[PDB]
Structures are given as C-alpha cells and as structure tokens.
From Swiss-Prot:
Binding site for heme: 425
Primary location: endoplasmic reticulum
Keyword Transport: no
Effect listed in the UniProt record for changing residue 405 to I: In allele CYP1A2*14
Record gene name: CYP1A2
Tissues and organs where the protein is expressed, per its UniProt entry: Liver.
Protein name as annotated: Cytochrome P450 1A2
C-alpha cells in the first residue's frame, strides 16, 4: 500500500469504524486547527474508514496547491457533490483534466468581459462598477424607507437582494427576474446548499447515513433541484432573445462560444457543459459576496469606532461632493484593510472546497496516494498564532502600512480566503471590487448600529460559507 522506503503522513489515534469523526464536531475547522497544532502542517485523519489529508500552514499549502499544483487539482468523488446541479459543475465535478481546464478559462473570460473589463456603452467604468453603483444607491433608498417605517431591518436580507441583482444582471441581463419569488426564495436560502456541501460532512463518509431520513439532506436535494430548474428556465428564456451580433451578458457570451465550438485536447466540448457554467458563476458569486457584505455590516454594527474611522477617511479623501468610486480604492487604505480583516477574522470560507490528488506523490517527504481526499484549512492559516498578533481580535490596522497610508501588501498575502493554485477563485478580483464599492457608497451616507442593550451574536455557523445568526434589529441613519 505504500512504496518501499517511504512513510505516510502523521495520523492521530482514532476509534474503530468512526475514525476521527467525533473529533470534528460542529466546528471542523476549529478542531482540525487544534489537531494540526499538535501533529503538523501535513497530517491525515480518517472519517469513517476514508483517509483524509489535512493541510494547515501557508508554506505547506503553497507547496501542495501551487508548486505541486497539478498533483493537487482534483475534486474528490463525494456523495453530496453528485447531487449538485447536473452533476457537472465546474466547481464540484470530479473532472480536472483538459475539459475542466478549458471550461474554467471560458467561465473566467466570459465572467471578466461582463464584470471587471470596461463597458463599451460607458465612457469610464467597468460593468461591475455600473451595476454596483446602481444597486448600492437603490439599497440606500430601500434602507431609508425601512427606517422611516418599522425602524429596523435584517442586513443579510437586504444584502441578498442587492447582490442577487448585480450577479443576475451580469449573468442574464434583462432576463433576470428581480421580482421572481422563485429566485428570491432560492437566494434567501442558500444556507440549505452551504450547510450540506461542506468539508467533513458525515454524509460523504458513511454510506449508511444516506438511507436514513435526513431533513438537512432533503433540503439540500430540493434546493439543488429548484436551483437547476430556475437556472435552466432562465437560460432557456434568454436563448429566445439572443443574437450573436449583440452579446450583452455571460449567458450570451457562453452561447456564442459554444456556437463556435470550443475544444479540449482536439475534441469538441458538449454545449451543455459550456452553457451550464453560469450555474457556478451565479451560485458561487451570489452566496460568497452576500455572506462577506453581511459579515462586514455586522462587524461595523459591533465596532462603532472602526465604522467611524472608515467614515472619517471617506470624508477626507472623497469629501461629500461626489460618491466613492473604484478608482478611489488605492486611496481608501482603511476601508481596504477593513475588508481584509472581515475576510481574515470571519474566515467565512473555513476550508477551500475539498481537493483530491491526481496521482501518487510525496509532500514534505510523506507519500500520498492518488485520489486522496484533501482538506485545506484557510481559517487555520488566518488565525495562526505564529502568523498574526492577536488572531482572535478584530483589527483592520494589522494590514495598514507603518504610516497607515496604504495596505501592507506583503502581509495581505498571508491571509488566505480564495484558495491558491489551479483551483483558486475565478471571481476574486470581482468580489474584492464589488465588496469595496458597496461598502464605500453605503457608508458614505449611512451609519449602521443596533440599539443599546440589543445583543449581537457573531459566532459563525459552520458551512461551505459560514453565516452569522440572523439579526433583525440593525438601524441606519444618515449623518451631518
Ligand atoms: C468574498 C468572496 C469570495 C470568496 C471568499 C470566494 C472563495 C472561493 C474559494 C475558497 C474557492 C475554492 C478554491 C479551491 O477549491 O481550492 C472558490 C472557487 C470558486 N469561486 Fe470564489 N469566492 C468568492 C467570490 C466569488 C465570486 C464573486 C464568484 C463568481 C462570480 C466566485 C466563483 C467561484 C467559482 C466558479 C469557483 C470554482 C473554481 C474551480 O473549481 O475551478 N467566487 N472561491
Ligand atoms: O450557494 C452556493 C455556494 C457556492 C460556493 C461555491 C464556491 C465557494 C463558495 C460557495 O456555490 C454554489 C452555491 C449554490 C449553487 C451552486 C451550483 C453550482 C455550483 C456552485 C454553487
């Protein structure tokens, strides 16, 4: 089982049949961070009888995902993943050869065309900035409306709407049904997806579990069926009002490409695997950004001074005679550091999506067989005692330069939330720019808080993306 002369990664003692599952508990990232602090940056655990490699140090993770990237770019064949959309997602499917590579590039390019690349019709900004500006204003209006009435709101719920509007435009243009209760019911409930498609879910390691009545699982299955139906219906409509001489969104750009015949290793890639790329773009893009923006607002509600510093900087740099813009990003050091600290401290992607090895290899001298499931603990990297001052504390200042006039780029680089290597997030820049512009436009006009005495629980709920408990008492007020 192991070649002559080599040894396997360090493995803690485990229970028969169970392996280390009881140790992961409700917060797998916290438990593995402790287990790694004892055994190493490269260890294996066992869930049920399935071996799982856990990587926890930034150096080791870079060695595996970047330098041995081709060995670590696989996705494991998990049960939960078989239930995702059409079983053919770019994110979750097990293919990681030339077809995955070609689909990723087409996804990435189409996404870039309609987001961060400048817009033709426009004279000065990219599509993203145009959509976000519009949606951030309308969000402000919606928030003032709610304050003039019930006098409070749920930040997560209002953020869902705006974010869904932005990514839906990019994906489907005018065909996106902003009013659809079918889509709103879906985007408000991605916790049904995220809670089940997370690292170490017992469903993926003990086949018995899937035969038992399981409401979380049934909700995962129904969410996925409803998600796929909505996406397919929307592309279908789209298809109807589509001309190759006027591509205006991601769906149309993928249609145009599929029509020309994209290939991989000399072979045509089936049209269905090209057009279904908006399923990954919309799913990942909506949920992540909504979670990030909601965590940021909650941080501000719970840290008035930080919120105040952010506001002081916008006044000083932009004034109050115009709204913030993307081109103001390098000059708004403190807001960028706020965002970076929202990412580090929450580590709302505690783990990257699970990886799998594509061939037998050795990592730091340890033998790892082909098709070994691999978990990468981003929360551990981001809370490493040896890597950061007070890991548990929320401090935007830790990312600022000595004179606090810019972001310490070298240190920003040790904060891992978008993966690394062959599988790293294709919407990273897009996400950073959208979160920035949303918060800048927002905070230039509104100050968020919760009434005195009202408690706010900021404990994250474990999942692919970690959510915070719902708080429906937040308030917003303009300010002199
Ligand atoms: C704060 C926001 C975001 C975070 C923290 C984030 C995080 C990540 C992470 C950790 C992965 C997994 C990498 C791996 O498996 O090793 C990933 C992949 C992915 N993300 Fe992002 N993401 C965010 C925003 C976006 C946006 C805005 C989009 C889409 C428009 C998106 C698109 C995707 C896609 C399609 C993949 C799968 C790529 C592949 O499997 O080749 N993400 N992201
Ligand atoms: O909520 C989701 C989060 C995520 C997600 C993906 C990567 C990182 C973080 C969240 O993606 C999806 C979500 C929902 C549906 C999806 C369908 C196909 C592919 C991905 C989907």
């Amino acid at each position: 089982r192991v070649p002559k002369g080599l040894k396997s990664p360090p493995e803690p003692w485990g229970w028969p049949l169970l392996g280390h599952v009881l140790t992961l508990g409700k917060n797998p990232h916290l438990a593995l961070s402790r287990m790694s602090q004892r055994y190493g940056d490269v260890l294996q655990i066992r869930i049920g009888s399935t071996p799982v490699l856990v990587l926890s140090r930034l150096d080791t993770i870079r060695q595996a995902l970047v330098r041995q990237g081709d060995d670590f770019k696989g996705r494991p064949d998990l049960y939960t993943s078989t239930l995702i959309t059409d079983g053919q997602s770019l994110t979750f499917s097990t293919d990681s050869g030339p077809v995955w590579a070609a689909r990723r590039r087409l996804a990435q390019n189409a996404l870039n065309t309609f987001s961060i690349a400048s817009d033709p019709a426009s004279s000065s900004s990219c599509y993203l900035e145009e959509h976000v500006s519009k949606e951030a204003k309308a969000l402000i209006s919606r928030l003032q409306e709610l304050m003039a009435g019930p006098g409070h709101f749920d930040p997560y719920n209002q953020v869902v709407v705006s974010v869904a509007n932005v990514i839906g435009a990019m994906c489907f243009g005018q065909h996106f049904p902003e009013s659809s209760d079918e889509m709103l019911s879906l985007v408000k409930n991605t916790h049904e997806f995220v809670e089940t498609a997370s690292s170490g879910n017992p469903l993926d390691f003990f086949p018995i579990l899937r035969y038992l009545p399981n409401p979380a699982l049934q909700r995962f299955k129904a969410f996925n069926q409803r998600f796929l139906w909505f996406l397919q219906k929307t592309v279908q409509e789209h298809y109807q009002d589509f001309d190759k001489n006027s591509v205006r969104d991601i769906t149309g750009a993928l249609f145009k490409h599929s029509k020309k015949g994209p290939r991989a290793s000399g072979n045509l890639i089936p049209q269905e695997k090209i057009v279904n790329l908006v399923n990954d773009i919309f799913g990942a893009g909506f949920d992540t950004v909504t979670t990030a923006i909601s965590w940021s607002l909650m941080y501000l509600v719970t840290k008035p001074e930080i919120q105040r510093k952010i506001q002081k900087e916008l006044d000083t740099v932009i004034g109050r005679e115009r709204r913030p813009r993307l081109s103001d990003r390098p000059q708004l050091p403190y807001l960028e550091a706020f965002i970076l600290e929202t990412f580090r401290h929450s580590s709302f992607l505690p783990f990257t999506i699970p990886h799998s090895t594509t061939r037998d290899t050795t990592l730091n001298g340890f033998y790892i067989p082909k098709k070994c499931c691999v978990f990468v603990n981003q929360w551990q990297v981001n809370h490493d005692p040896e890597l950061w001052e007070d890991p548990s504390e929320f401090r935007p200042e830790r990312f600022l330069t000595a004179d606090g006039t810019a972001i310490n780029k070298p240190l920003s680089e040790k904060m891992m939330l978008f993966g690394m290597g062959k599988r790293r997030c294709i919407g990273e820049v897009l996400a950073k720019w959208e979160i920035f512009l949303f918060l800048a436009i927002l905070l230039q006009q509104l100050e968020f808080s919760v009434p005195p005495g009202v408690k706010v629980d900021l404990t994250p709920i474990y999942g692919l993306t970690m959510k915070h408990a719902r708080c429906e008492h937040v308030q917003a007020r303009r300010f002199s």
